Design a protein around this nucleic acid. Structure first.
Ligand SMILES: [Mg+2]
Ligand SMILES: [Mg+2]
Ligand SMILES: [Mg+2]
Ligand SMILES: [Mg+2]
Ligand SMILES: [Mg+2]
Ligand SMILES: [Mg+2]
Ligand SMILES: [Mg+2]
Ligand SMILES: [Mg+2]
Ligand SMILES: [Mg+2]
Ligand SMILES: [Mg+2]
Ligand SMILES: [Mg+2]
Ligand SMILES: [Mg+2]
Ligand SMILES: [Mg+2]
Ligand SMILES: [Mg+2]
Ligand SMILES: [Mg+2]
Ligand SMILES: [Mg+2]
Ligand SMILES: [Mg+2]
Ligand SMILES: [Mg+2]
Ligand SMILES: [Mg+2]
Ligand SMILES: [Mg+2]
Ligand SMILES: [Mg+2]
Ligand SMILES: [Mg+2]
Ligand SMILES: [Mg+2]
Ligand SMILES: [Mg+2]
Ligand SMILES: [Mg+2]
Ligand SMILES: [Mg+2]
Ligand SMILES: [Mg+2]
Ligand SMILES: [Mg+2]
Ligand SMILES: [Mg+2]
Ligand SMILES: [Mg+2]
Ligand SMILES: [Mg+2]
Ligand SMILES: [Mg+2]
Ligand SMILES: [Mg+2]
Ligand SMILES: [Mg+2]
Ligand SMILES: [Mg+2]
Ligand SMILES: [Mg+2]
Ligand SMILES: [Mg+2]
Ligand SMILES: [Mg+2]
Ligand SMILES: [Mg+2]
Ligand SMILES: [Mg+2]
Ligand SMILES: [Mg+2]
Ligand SMILES: [Mg+2]
Ligand SMILES: [Mg+2]
Ligand SMILES: [Mg+2]
Ligand SMILES: [Mg+2]
Ligand SMILES: [Mg+2]
Ligand SMILES: [Mg+2]
Ligand SMILES: [Mg+2]
Ligand SMILES: [Mg+2]
Ligand SMILES: [Mg+2]
Ligand SMILES: [Mg+2]
Ligand SMILES: [Mg+2]
Ligand SMILES: [Mg+2]
Ligand SMILES: [Mg+2]
Ligand SMILES: [Mg+2]
Ligand SMILES: [Mg+2]
Ligand SMILES: [Mg+2]
Ligand SMILES: [Mg+2]
Ligand SMILES: [Mg+2]
Ligand SMILES: [Mg+2]
Ligand SMILES: [Mg+2]
Ligand SMILES: [Mg+2]
Ligand SMILES: [Zn+2]
Lengths: 23, 155, 83, 206, 60, 9
RNA sequence: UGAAACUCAAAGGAAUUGACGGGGGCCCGCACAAGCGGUGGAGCAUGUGGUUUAAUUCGAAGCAACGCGAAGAACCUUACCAGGCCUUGACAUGCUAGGGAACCCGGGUGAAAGCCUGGGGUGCCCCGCGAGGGGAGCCCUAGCACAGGUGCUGCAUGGCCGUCGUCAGCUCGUGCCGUGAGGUGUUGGGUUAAGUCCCGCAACGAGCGCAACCCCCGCCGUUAGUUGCCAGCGGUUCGGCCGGGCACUCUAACGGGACUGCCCGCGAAAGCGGGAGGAAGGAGGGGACGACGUCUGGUCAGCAUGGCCCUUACGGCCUGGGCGACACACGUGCUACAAUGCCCACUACAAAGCGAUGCCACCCGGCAACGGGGAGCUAAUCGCAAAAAGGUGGGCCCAGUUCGGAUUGGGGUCUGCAACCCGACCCCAUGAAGCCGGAAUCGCUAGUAAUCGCGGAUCAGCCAUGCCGCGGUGAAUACG
């Protein structure tokens, strides 16, 4: 869920990007 | 609701069967404003309910609603500090509401994995007089029959 | 941690004291208030009095603690439990 | 402990700003500080002239500073001496083109900041607070206004128990926006501490 | 620790981090708007006073 | 009643 | 039948204004009921009690203290602690005195502050070919006057705020009644969201309140046509892109519009029900707005201010520490316990804001955080920007899991002088509790609740899951 930085929903929740939510 | 009694919201009839009772039932399926997902669940079961038991889906739905409407229920009244169980006749507005509410809840208590199947089977079992929602209706009707001694406190 | 594009950070005014010791044939007690200094292989063998807000705390420097910071070995709060 | 400020409530409606200019997010604070720094000096000096308002207008490296006042005398000076002596010191802080003006106050007893200052000054002289209030209200109504109310709050007469006392005549409808109500505050220091005077003058509805 | 602190804030600091905002009017180190250079309290006092150009009470 | 300086509390 | 000692500054009668009642009547409010989602259990975030500490600065204390002052505690902030320093002081005016300095770059020591120090060399007006001597922005030091104190008293205060409460109230002038407090008006019938109106009446008026004037939203017009718009022709690298145009959508200023104005019925009236027309109907939805007063409510720490206290120190500078402690206990929250769910890929539709040591397209290196290049925009132009839920396809198959993402190892990135205490972010590994929560308890009546994301203030960065806003999807229920 939103608390797991290692997923897309987590990256959305903290407003960050990475391998699990890139641009 | 002191001043005037509230007005009953009229619902936009559904875009398939054109039936308000269908729209009301989908609203009881809906959680967190996902009416799209909600209406999608209800219609998928209508498919299931036409496959299994080839009756008309809308016809099965309404009869299941009829088999779950309770005609009597217990309420609370005073006469001193006492708290009576008073048997009351259920209004048509409330018969429909309790019937719809117990159906979704009974459906979601079922063990089928996906939501439409739970609603399909519950609407099937209800239209034949079985299911948790019917057991809930009969249960309510019983408690008003037992406390029929205090029926003279009704209003 | 600190970007390695930058340097391994030492306040210089402490690294100064360390290097003059190595040249002159150490040891000597080293009193610093720079907890933020990074321990560095030139510090191995010495004892450094690290300030913790109240006292200069001696810290003998060993090889296995080289990569750390100075304040890590001068704890800043006294606790010894409840009850 | 509840009522809202009567001017700021009506800004853009019945009351207009005391600083009229545009700026951008780059130097808005620098100019606004200048207004305050300028307006600081003026109220300090022109107090003895009964300063009832300071208007500021700006274009670029120049400023208005229109000073309303009950007695233009202490402003202008001898043939325009004080008006120069201050305008000199003025741009000595502004570093700009500071064109001081002096507008007369039609009726001073129809100005709220003046009525408050006359009461604040009267009670510093140890005058009967309850009386000074009724008189001030009496003057403002004799001056034709449609309503007046005056509030003094603190250790009246120097009592240990603080108190609030007020008087009013006619009508003062603070909830009404189209009602022109001039508001003004004056603070009176005494041997025993600070008192606070609120003046409300109701001119009319527009 | 007030006047010495309202003066030390104006001073140029040994590092650009030690610089902090400070209300030009009263001296608050907290709730200081960059736009006005004021604090939330003085901002309210001058707004009600009309000494802030164009600013007014918003309502919607 | 309120710590502040000497009084502390 | 019937004392006294001793003891009290009263004990009492009627009546008045309140407040209260497990008195009565008549009303109302998410007050209950009816519903829907939560809190109380879990892990984490944040505030607090408590303890601990050299210090864990101070305030706030039932509703109305407890994500509150804090709209940004690593240093600063910072008020606390330790230690090293400064003594007319970091700062204000005023007086002299010596140097007679202006300003900008250095040096030694030191954690820094500080202490010690060295160079570049004074405009007014002048006696000026003369040596130059004085006068003065301003500086430095000496000495006074004084400054400084987030020390105390919110039981001395101003100002501002909370609160009862958006509750329908609180009053005054004259007249009348009462020895008097006081009463009447303001009560009474009806009515309303309302002391809102109607009617009645020893009352007749009036003020603060209510409503209204003000703002956002809903329909229509007008004036405008670029950076916005593209209906219809013309080109068209196929992008409103170029011609053209302002029709439309819009944007932003001014107007229109609703008045229970009309019909039916009830009524003494005010009004109430219903209907018509209309985008909108009975105050259209939301906002701003808070009566006399109450809590000796909050704030002397935003500011102001009486009084009391400190004056080589309770003032001032610095480095470091603490404000982040942890057997515990409470509040407010975030994320969840899964299939109406989780994951991956592709594909749509917002609004309000922000943006020149700023937003940063686009390109390249890198799994990535980010780095390097590098256009455009002082911005209806260029950027933040992807909105998310949703739609399509695909996977997981009821497991402590492809649920949950705490804890911890290791490796990096960025800001910053500096991330040990004590930052955010990225990557690999780790993968805890938690199976829907005991007694108890909260919010909400409609574009609301629930859910979904977006921006802003503060701000180097950020412990923001907080706050103030914005739209997307969009319910249930009200007998009483
Ligand atoms: Mg997962
Ligand atoms: Mg963003
Ligand atoms: Mg005295
Ligand atoms: Mg101090
Ligand atoms: Mg001060
Ligand atoms: Mg800062
Ligand atoms: Mg600040
Ligand atoms: Mg006797
Ligand atoms: Mg009695
Ligand atoms: Mg009573
Ligand atoms: Mg309930
Ligand atoms: Mg429930
Ligand atoms: Mg939640
Ligand atoms: Mg608990
Ligand atoms: Mg909890
Ligand atoms: Mg505390
Ligand atoms: Mg404590
Ligand atoms: Mg306390
Ligand atoms: Mg609260
Ligand atoms: Mg913070
Ligand atoms: Mg600190
Ligand atoms: Mg410090
Ligand atoms: Mg008070
Ligand atoms: Mg007060
Ligand atoms: Mg006292
Ligand atoms: Mg009202
Ligand atoms: Mg009341
Ligand atoms: Mg009352
Ligand atoms: Mg009378
Ligand atoms: Mg009489
Ligand atoms: Mg008599
Ligand atoms: Mg009376
Ligand atoms: Mg009457
Ligand atoms: Mg009354
Ligand atoms: Mg009365
Ligand atoms: Mg009466
Ligand atoms: Mg009225
Ligand atoms: Mg047009
Ligand atoms: Mg109003
Ligand atoms: Mg108190
Ligand atoms: Mg207190
Ligand atoms: Mg004081
Ligand atoms: Mg103070
Ligand atoms: Mg610290
Ligand atoms: Mg804190
Ligand atoms: Mg939280
Ligand atoms: Mg909780
Ligand atoms: Mg920003
Ligand atoms: Mg999707
Ligand atoms: Mg497991
Ligand atoms: Mg377990
Ligand atoms: Mg898993
Ligand atoms: Mg690690
Ligand atoms: Mg840190
Ligand atoms: Mg399970
Ligand atoms: Mg629950
Ligand atoms: Mg759940
Ligand atoms: Mg409501
Ligand atoms: Mg969720
Ligand atoms: Mg930041
Ligand atoms: Mg920020
Ligand atoms: Mg946010
Ligand atoms: Zn301020």
């Amino acid at each position: 869920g939103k608390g797991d930085r290692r997923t897309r929903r987590g990256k959305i929740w903290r407003g960050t990007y990475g391998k699990y939510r890139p641009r | 609701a002191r001043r005037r009694r509230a007005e009953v919201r009229q619902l936009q009839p559904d875009l398939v069967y054109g039936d308000v009772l269908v729209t009301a039932f989908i609203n009881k399926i809906m959680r967190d404003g996902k009416k799209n997902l909600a209406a999608r669940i209800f219609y998928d079961a209508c498919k299931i309910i036409q496959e299994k038991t080839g009756q008309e889906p809308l016809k099965v739905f309404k009869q299941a609603v009829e088999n779950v409407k309770p005609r009597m229920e217990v309420r609370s009244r005073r006469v001193g500090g006492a708290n009576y169980q008073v048997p009351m006749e259920v209004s048509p507005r409330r018969q429909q509401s309790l019937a719809l509410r117990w159906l979704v809840q009974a459906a979601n208590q079922r063990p089928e994995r996906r939501a439409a199947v739970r609603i399909a089977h519950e609407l099937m079992d209800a239209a034949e007089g079985k299911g948790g929602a019917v057991k809930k209706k009969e249960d309510v009707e019983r408690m008003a029959e037992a406390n029929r001694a205090y029926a003279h406190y009704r209003w | 941690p600190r970007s390695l594009k930058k340097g391994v950070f030492v306040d210089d005014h402490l690294l100064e004291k360390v290097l003059e010791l190595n040249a002159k044939g150490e040891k000597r007690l080293i009193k610093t208030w720079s907890r933020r200094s990074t321990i560095v292989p030139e510090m191995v063998g010495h004892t450094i009095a690290v300030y913790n807000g109240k006292q200069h705390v001696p810290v003998y420097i060993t090889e296995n603690m080289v990569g750390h910071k100075l304040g890590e070995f001068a704890p800043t709060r006294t606790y010894r439990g409840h009850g | 402990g509840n009522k809202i400020h009567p001017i700021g409530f009506r800004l853009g409606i019945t009351r207009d700003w005391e600083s009229r200019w545009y700026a951008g997010k780059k130097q808005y604070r620098h100019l606004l500080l200048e207004d305050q720094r300028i307006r600081g000096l003026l109220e300090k000096e022109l107090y003895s002239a009964g300063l009832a308002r300071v208007d500021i207008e700006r274009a670029a490296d120049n400023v208005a500073v229109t000073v309303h006042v009950a007695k233009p005398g202490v402003v202008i000076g001898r043939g325009g001496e004080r008006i120069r002596v201050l305008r000199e010191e003025l741009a000595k802080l502004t570093g700009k083109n500071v064109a001081l003006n002096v507008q007369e106050v039609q009726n001073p007893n129809l100005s709220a900041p003046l009525v408050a200052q006359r009461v604040a000054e009267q009670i510093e002289r140890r005058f009967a607070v309850r009386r000074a209030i009724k008189q001030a209200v009496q003057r403002v109504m004799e001056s034709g206004a449609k309503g007046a109310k005056v509030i003094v709050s603190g250790r009246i007469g120097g009592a240990e128990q603080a108190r609030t006392e007020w008087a009013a005549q006619g009508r003062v409808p603070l909830h009404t926006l189209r009602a022109n109500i001039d508001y003004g505050f004056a603070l009176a220091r005494t041997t025993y501490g600070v008192l606070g005077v609120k003046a409300y003058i109701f001119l009319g509805e527009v | 620790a007030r006047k010495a602190l309202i003066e030390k804030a104006k001073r140029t600091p040994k590092f650009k981090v030690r610089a902090y905002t400070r209300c030009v009017r009263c001296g608050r180190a907290r709730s200081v708007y960059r736009f006005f250079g004021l604090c939330r309290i003085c901002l309210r006092e001058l707004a009600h006073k009309g000494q802030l150009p164009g600013v007014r009470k918003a309502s919607w | 009643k309120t710590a502040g300086x000497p009084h502390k509390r």
